[PDB]
């Protein structure tokens, strides 16, 4: 191609999206936004294929013009808005909230969420830097750019952010024996507490994690996402608690 493409095949979609082969040749190519391409979800696939409330693009389009849903308080009117993991979805006329969070089945997962939990949101600080005029700041995993954070925080760090001000509620460091979500990889969604971290200078650092059934596995730090302390999640968790069984 002599540039980017506007087109997305049916089979070209990520497998976790659970979209059939037969009701289309095309998947809706998601627009650019916070998250990256394969670990997102368009809102129309969210609504029609999970919430089932609309069945057509004209329907969901009319809804977006009806200005209902606010993602983190902000409405989008984009159909293919790239909604990713750990997201707050606010439903006014139905009076609900939804945390978008990975499935034990490796898929995504809606979560029925109250207003107090929707008031804030979580974020993996991925890069702390020093900006122009010597201003210190961070960029999270969801692309939130926050000036002037607490100096004790470093990269990859879990931060509770109030959405209502878009401000740093509090933070959680990266220690062993912290409750961690795994975002990507084969074992994603399997919530566990970190055993430790095999570190490599310049290399992909591996992480050993043990979960409640005393089961240990190893993923990469990119998949690693700390939630909270032991028995202390800052969020409400869905059924199964991220536990793989037979």
């Amino acid at each position: 191609a002599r540039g980017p493409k506007k087109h997305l095949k049916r089979l070209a979609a990520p497998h976790h999206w659970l979209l059939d082969k037969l009701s289309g040749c095309y998947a809706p190519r998601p627009s650019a936004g916070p998250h990256k391409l394969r670990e997102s979800l368009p809102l129309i696939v969210f609504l029609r294929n999970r919430l089932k409330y609309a069945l057509n693009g004209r329907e969901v389009k009319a809804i977006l013009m009806q200005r209902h849903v606010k993602v983190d308080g902000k409405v989008r009117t984009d159909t293919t808005y790239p909604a990713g993991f750990m997201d707050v979805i606010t439903l006014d006329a139905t009076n609900e909230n939804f945390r978008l969070v990975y499935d034990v089945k490796g898929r995504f997962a809606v979560h029925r969420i109250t207003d107090e939990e929707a008031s804030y949101k979580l974020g993996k600080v991925k890069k702390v830097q020093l900006g122009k005029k010597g201003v210190p700041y961070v960029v999270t995993h969801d692309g939130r750019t926050i000036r002037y954070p607490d100096p004790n925080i470093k990269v990859n760090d879990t931060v509770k952010i109030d959405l209502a001000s878009g401000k740093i509620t509090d933070f959680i460091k990266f220690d062993a024996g912290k409750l961690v979500y795994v975002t990507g990889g084969r074992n994603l969604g399997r919530i566990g507490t970190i055993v430790h971290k095999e570190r490599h200078d310049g290399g992909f650092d591996l992480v050993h994690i043990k979960d409640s059934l005393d089961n240990t596995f190893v993923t990469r730090l990119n998949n690693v996402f700390v939630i909270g302390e032991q028995g202390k999640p800052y969020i409400s968790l869905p059924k199964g608690k991220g536990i793989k069984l037979s």
Partner: protein, 1089 residues
């Protein structure tokens, strides 16, 4: 304009106010398969299960949890009535819109189920409901407005009978929201209580309406409540689609009687009148006729009381409302007019008479007009002239087919002495409108005419009040129909003797006397005194009336040959801004040339045609073609001095005429016959240059103050009736203040001759197009240069362009003073002025400037600036300026560098430009750099202090002088920093303005209060920078030159503000004054301080 033509898309933006304007209430004008109206278990339960299906809001779900635990049947309603209602109002004041729609719906059906016993709840329900409406006003939901007022109409339909028994209390519960200052809130509450009004029975109607009348007089201040009751009764009669009904005419009966009560407010009478107007506008006459019958009935009932004014008011509205298209019988109305007139046995009488003369049918007017005019002649005698004026502006042709002039003559015969100032006020006004030839034909009372003539006989004139009375009796004395010429004569020469310098009033009044002439020696005397009485249109009109009355005989030819200067004085009259007076001068001069001889030319006739052309964009090309045609004819044809002066002053009138295609035409025309006559036009253009900055006072005679004005009619709300009463009241105000209105309308008929400010710029464009004659004299424009105007910058620029376009530029009148001002404006900051100054300076031909022409040109240019600086301002390089050429062109370089330093450093670009200026400064030479410093000190001054010792001559602490000061001390700091060790100081060019500036900073600190925050801030900055450059120059030069002369003065400016508290002020960080003191205490020669 609203959206009338619907576009094709399914989704309009539909703003909130538009939603409000489209919203209505009544569900009976709506309908549907209502679920509560559809299933009949219980209405409240049906609505509750329906909204339990529909709504998903947390407020309503908690509510529904509680209530679906509480009530499941109508006995459960009747048992737990209070608790469910308290939970209802709890969530109602919990204020959730998503729950507010269904909760309002359950409120409505809860009342529908609980009817007769609900009222105890219903009252504080009204309270909380109107609180919720105010909450929606804080919010912005047309949906919430619709839901609330729909619920309101629901409760009204459910609980009608108890509320129509207790109606006036329900009005009181909503009055603060009816009188609430929101038109649409008032409108919606008016629709709901209007439904209730159309429901209510007659006894409660009369009671409630009378109490509304008293409530109106209580809140006489409020108009929103007034209009609310307007639209209330309006909708109560309007309710259907096009036809008011029998309940509407019953309401009309009730309101009509209750307002025809003598104690009823006349404000409520106007309210009724506007209600009637709106109903008449809405409904059709087939629906309207029984209401007309009930109206005539109640008129014949209550026709005899003290409220004849009130019935006259409502009848005036009835006659005016639309037309005979809703009026059944002008004959019935005529009968009621006879009844009201017999019962009366003023202002509103005049208005009703005029509206009947307009609005009625001619088949009724052919019989009632005699009775109408006898009624008017008898009753409204002084108001007859006001009425006749309003009727002539309303429908003149009606009375002209009828006998307006006859009854006018009868009125004049019956009375002419009482309101003779109003008589002229009528007869002055009729002159302008040319549809009044019958009026300018009509006759006058003979006693009145002879009394005016005898007052003219016995007239003393030596007062401007006497001028007022004589001019008044003249403007009555127009239609004298007698030989009045020899009676005009002695008063005319009396004025011409007694007044050498006439007032504009004097000219106008004697010109009215020239108009009074109908059918020799008067022409002789006006040819004597026209030189005084030239410029006034009323004079010119009466004079042309004389001349057109006259016939060209040979004795008059002899006298006109004896009188020489008439046509040149008329050319001077052609030089005037007013096209009307210039065309009047035109036709006068034509007729005079016919009387004199037969030399009447095509130029005069054509330019008459040109003044006769109106001004449109469609006639613009035509007019410019015409101007080019007449200019070509004037240039081709041979010219007398008379006709040349004519053509020139006429073209300059067309310069004044204020039209761009005409300006193009005259700019095409004039550069070919300025050769024909370049002498007179030199005075014409120069007069325009001196035009407006000289005063233009048009001081007229002012009469004494008379306070005649009345609210002669009620205040309306329908805007057409508002316009009519405004017109009638304006004419009444004039007729009451007849004195000054005669004065003002005379000025309104006098005409303007004040020149535009742009005429100076037009003369500047003429001076651009014609440089040689400006290059010829130059003696009168030299004062403008040497006074420096304040003119506009574009004026100065086009003048500088004329200066560049000058050819013999060195042999102008004061060449060196021109060069001085040229150098000043070259040093000026405005780069366009610098360009034009260099253009005039290069018009000044000297071989060194011809050498470095393009050099200083690219120096003036911006994007080659620093490169040119590094190129040929660099010492010991290519294109470096030679010795004697440098000596002779040096001041120009310092002027352009003064400007390029005078640019403000708004950005890094301008900052770097100024930096490069000051950084290439160190290389030139000592006296040249000192001359740049001399110019920098020359933009300032020190001779105040140094003609004194240290005393201020005038306390000028002004922003302009201190901004020049701070620019000076800033370039002083910069020059210090870039020439620390090498620069020459001069006590006259460097030292004295600096101590002048620090002392000025101290004086603007001390002498004024601390309220001038910007002046005191700039004072602090000036002291800062002045002491900064003080210590800078002290460390920079040390002992390189002497210090003993200015020693005591700089020590004085040290010891005045600082040494008292220098220890208290300078302790945080070492001040520049501290560094100065330490350089003093270190350098041994500076130990004297």
């Amino acid at each position: 304009q609203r959206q009338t033509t619907k576009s094709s898309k399914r989704y309009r933006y539909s703003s909130f106010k538009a939603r409000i304007d489209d919203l209505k209430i009544e569900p009976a004008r709506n309908l549907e398969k209502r679920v509560h109206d559809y299933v009949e278990s219980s209405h409240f339960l049906a609505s509750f299960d329906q909204w339990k299906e529909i709504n998903l809001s947390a407020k309503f779900t908690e509510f529904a949890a509680e209530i679906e635990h509480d009530v499941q049947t109508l006995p459960q309603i009747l048992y737990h009535d209070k608790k469910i209602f308290n939970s209802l109002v709890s969530f109602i004041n919990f204020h959730d819109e998503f729950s507010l729609q269904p909760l309002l719906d359950l409120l409505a059906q809860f009342c529908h189920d609980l009817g007769p016993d609900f009222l105890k709840f219903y009252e504080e329900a009204i309270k909380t409901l109107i609180n919720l409406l105010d909450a929606a006003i804080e919010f912005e939901s047309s949906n919430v407005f619709e839901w609330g007022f729909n619920c309101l109409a629901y409760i009204f339909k459910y609980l009608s009978k108890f509320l129509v028994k207790k109606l006036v209390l329900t009005c009181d519960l909503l009055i603060p929201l009816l009188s609430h200052s929101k038109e649409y809130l008032s409108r919606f509450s008016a629709e709901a209580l209007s439904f209730l009004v159309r429901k209510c029975p007659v006894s409660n109607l009369r009671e409630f309406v009378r109490s509304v009348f008293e409530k109106l007089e209580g809140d006489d201040e409020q108009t929103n409540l007034y209009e609310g009751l307007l639209i209330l009764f309006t909708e109560s009669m309007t309710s259907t689609q096009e036809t008011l009904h029998s309940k509407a005419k019953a309401i009309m009966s009730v309101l009509l009687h209750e307002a025809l009560t003598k104690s009823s407010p006349e404000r409520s009478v106007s309210l009724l009148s506007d209600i009637w107007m709106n109903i008449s506008k809405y409904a059709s006459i087939e629906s309207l006729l029984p209401v007309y019958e009930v109206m005539y009935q109640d008129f014949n009932d209550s026709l005899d009381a003290t409220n004849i004014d009130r019935i006259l008011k409502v009848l005036t509205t009835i006659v005016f409302s639309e037309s005979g298209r809703k009026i059944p019988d002008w004959n019935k109305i005529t009968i009621l007019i006879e009844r009201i007139m017999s019962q009366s046995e003023q202002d509103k009488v005049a208005f009703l008479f005029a509206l009947f003369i307009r609005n009625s049918d001619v088949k009724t007017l052919t019989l009632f007009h005699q009775k109408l005019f006898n009624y008017a002649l008898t009753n409204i005698s002084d108001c007859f002239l006001e009425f006749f004026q309003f009727a002539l502006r309303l429908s003149y042709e009606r009375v002209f087919s009828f006998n307006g002039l006859k009854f006018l003559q009868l009125f004049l015969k019956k009375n002419w002495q009482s309101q003779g100032k109003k008589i002229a006020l009528f007869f002055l006004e009729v002159d302008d409108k040319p549809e009044l030839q019958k009026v300018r034909e009509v006759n006058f009372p003979e006693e009145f005419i002879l009394s005016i003539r005898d007052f003219f006989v016995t007239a003393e004139i030596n007062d401007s009040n006497d001028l007022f009375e004589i001019y008044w009796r003249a403007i009555i004395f127009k239609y004298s129909k007698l030989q009045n010429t020899e009676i005009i004569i002695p008063l005319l020469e009396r004025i011409f003797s007694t007044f050498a310098s006439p007032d504009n009033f004097t000219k106008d009044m004697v010109g009215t006397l020239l108009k009074i002439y109908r059918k020799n020696n008067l022409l002789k005397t006006i040819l004597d005194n026209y030189e005084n009485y030239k410029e006034s249109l009323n004079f010119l009109r009466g004079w042309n009336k004389l001349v057109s009355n006259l016939h060209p005989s040979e004795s008059l030819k002899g006298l006109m040959s004896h009188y020489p200067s008439l046509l040149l004085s008329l050319t001077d009259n052609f030089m005037l801004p007013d096209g009307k007076i210039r065309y009047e001068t035109l036709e006068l001069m034509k007729t005079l040339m016919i009387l004199q001889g037969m030399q009447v030319p095509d130029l005069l006739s054509s330019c008459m045609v040109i003044e006769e052309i109106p001004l449109t964009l469609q006639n613009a090309r035509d007019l410019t073609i015409r101007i080019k045609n007449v200019g070509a004819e004037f240039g081709k044809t041979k010219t007398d001095k008379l006709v040349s002066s004519f053509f020139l002053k006429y073209l300059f009138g067309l310069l004044t005429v204020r039209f761009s295609p005409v300006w193009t035409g005259v700019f095409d025309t004039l550069p070919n016959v300025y050769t024909k006559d370049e002498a007179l036009v030199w005075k014409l253009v120069l007069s325009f240059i001196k035009l407006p900055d000289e005063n233009q006072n048009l001081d007229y005679y002012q009469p004494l103050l008379e306070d005649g004005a009345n609210k002669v009619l009620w205040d309306s709300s329908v805007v057409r009736l508002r316009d009519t009463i405004d017109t009638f009241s304006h004419i009444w105000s004039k007729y009451s203040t007849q004195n000054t209105s005669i004065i003002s309308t005379t000025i309104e008929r006098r005409g303007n001759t004040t020149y535009p400010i742009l005429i100076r710029n037009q003369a500047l464009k003429v001076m651009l197009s014609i440089p040689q004659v400006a290059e010829n004299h130059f003696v009168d424009i030299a004062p403008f240069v040497y006074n420096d105007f304040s003119w506009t910058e574009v004026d100065r620029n086009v003048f500088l362009k004329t200066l560049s376009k000058f050819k013999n530029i060195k042999n102008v009148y004061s060449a060196t003073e021109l060069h001085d001002h040229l150098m000043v404006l070259l040093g000026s900051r405005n780069t366009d002025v610098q360009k034009l100054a260099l253009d005039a300076l290069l018009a000044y031909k000297n071989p060194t400037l011809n050498k470095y022409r393009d050099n200083l040109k690219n120096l003036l240019d911006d994007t080659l600036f620093k490169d040119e600086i590094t190129t040929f301002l660099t010492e010991n390089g290519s294109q470096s300026i030679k010795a004697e050429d440098e000596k002779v062109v040096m001041p120009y370089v310092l002027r352009i560098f003064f400007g390029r330093a005078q640019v403000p450093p708004t950005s890094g670009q301008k900052r770097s430009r100024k930096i490069a200026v000051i950084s290439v400064l160190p290389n030139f030479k000592k006296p040249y750099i000192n001359d740049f410093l001399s110019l920098a000190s020359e933009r300032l001054d020190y001779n105040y202090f140094f003609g004194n010792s240290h005393q201020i001559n005038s306390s000028k602490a002004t922003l302009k002088t201190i901004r020049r000061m701070t620019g000076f001390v800033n370039i002083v700091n910069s020059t210090l920093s870039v020439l620390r060790t090498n620069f020459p100081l001069h006590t006259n060019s460097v030292l004295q303005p600096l101590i002048y500036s620090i002392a000025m900073a101290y004086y603007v600190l001390d002498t004024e209060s601390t309220e001038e925050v910007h002046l005191r801030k700039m004072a602090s900055n000036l002291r800062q920078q002045g002491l900064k450059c003080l210590s800078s120059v002290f460390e920079f030069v040390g002992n390189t030159f002497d210090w003993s002369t200015s020693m005591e003065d700089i020590y004085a400016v040290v010891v005045k503000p600082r040494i008292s508290h220098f220890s208290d002020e300078n302790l945080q960080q070492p001040s520049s004054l501290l560094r100065l003191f330490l350089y003093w205490a270190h350098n041994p020669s500076l130990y004297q301080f």
